[PDB]
Ligand SMILES: O=c1cnn([C@@H]2O[C@H](COP(=O)(O)O)[C@@H](O)[C@H]2O)c(=O)[nH]1
């Protein structure tokens with residue numbers, strides 16, 4: 001599995017290149033894994049991945065939540081890996097063919113897929129929560145090794161960990177701004193994803209260091 | 220939304236020159252182009268403005284927005300800043316995620332298209348069983364524009380029933396995925412067509428042929 005420094009992944013959702021680079025640079029001593037999503041990519045271009053690689057010693061997870069038909073999913077994954085992303089996130093709710101399309105490209109291209117199981121926001125209760133255990137089981141059957149699950153629902157995160165097994169890699173957003181606790185989340189997740197609690201802080205480095213201090217015995 | 224010839228081009232070529240050339244070849248037949256991540260992630264969001272400059276066509280950004288509310292808002296803002304007239308949004312992530320998109324669309328004078336049931340085989344696993352409820356959620360939220368599957372006209376018909384005749388419904392899965400243009404237009408206001416046009420030996424003839432086949436419906 002990827003070796004995530006300090007079990008902490010920065011969710012870099014600032015939408016301005018200068019601010020995104022400044023903040024990421026400020027926390028780089030604490031974090032070697034950065035999640036870049038559509039807020040930044042659609043604002044600054046896919047070349048932002050190249051820029052981050054050039055500036056920082058960071059792996060890049062492209063959080064694109066791929067959710068199209070198999071043929072379009074393949075194209076999205078190809079473009080994303082061509083740009084230099086180490087990994088891409090993929091929704092499971094569109095079904096096994098859509099997931100398989102992404103896995104096939106990732107295999108061919110030597111990169112990784114993260115399967116999104118249950119999401120951390122309130123609306124996830126409406127449809128996703130009821131499908132999530134089956135989505136996770138589907139991932140296991142398809143050979144998915146990397147998963148995303150919700151910090152905001154420890155009971156759900158624990159169940160999802162059970163389903164995927166201890167050998168699978170699990171990362172978890174919803175820590176901080178959405179209400180999730182770093183320590184409790186790391187009982188089940190390999191790494192926590194943190195965005196606003198760091199990138200909106202007056203001192204993002206101090207914010208990151210504070211989170212890390214609070215989980216030091218878990219490192 | 221008034222779509223010329225009830226036909227929306229799905230421009231999923233991933234090279235700028237080819238995308239512009241092929242769109243140019245079929246421009247007399249359409250005034251609405253769906254641009255998705257295959258083209259945008261290959262050539263950048265500036266491609267949207269370029270299409271508007273060259274063709275004046277309406278642009279639907281088929282981004283299938285599927286994040287938490289806060290991220291959805293940011294995705295919609297970036298997308299509309301680039302000049303998209305509309306954006307597609309998954310309903311599966313729930314009502315708050317959809318509302319986030321509706322808010323930005325209202326603010327910027329744009330439209331949200333709610334994706335109800337998808338057209339590929341995997342849609343049967345989870346989406347199909349939620350789709351009627353997703354459509355009712357759209358109605359509850361005041362959504363006026365919807366996407367449903369050409370490949371299952373009985374499901375497309377049910378979705379039309381739920382949303383009513385006043386709502387606007389577009390439908391992909393025509394041609395390559397097996398759906399029929401005329402049958403789909405029994406229920407949808409417009410059909411989305413990608414590969415059957417953009418992979419054709421002669422895209423203009425392909426478009427003309429589709430339109431010929433539905434001429435009585437225009
Ligand atoms: O279920 C979820 C919830 N959030 N996120 C993403 O993780 C980050 C959460 O950031 P935050 O710490 O500012 O809440 C954002 O990029 C959000 O899109 C997910 O991928 N899945």
Ligand SMILES: O=c1cnn([C@@H]2O[C@H](COP(=O)(O)O)[C@@H](O)[C@H]2O)c(=O)[nH]1
Nearest residue numbers: 068069072229337338391395412413414
């Ligand atoms: O349920 C679906 C099925 N397809 N599409 C999109 O519509 C287009 C279908 O193209 P095609 O005519 O080449 O199959 C592609 O861009 C695909 O991502 C959807 O939005 N929803």
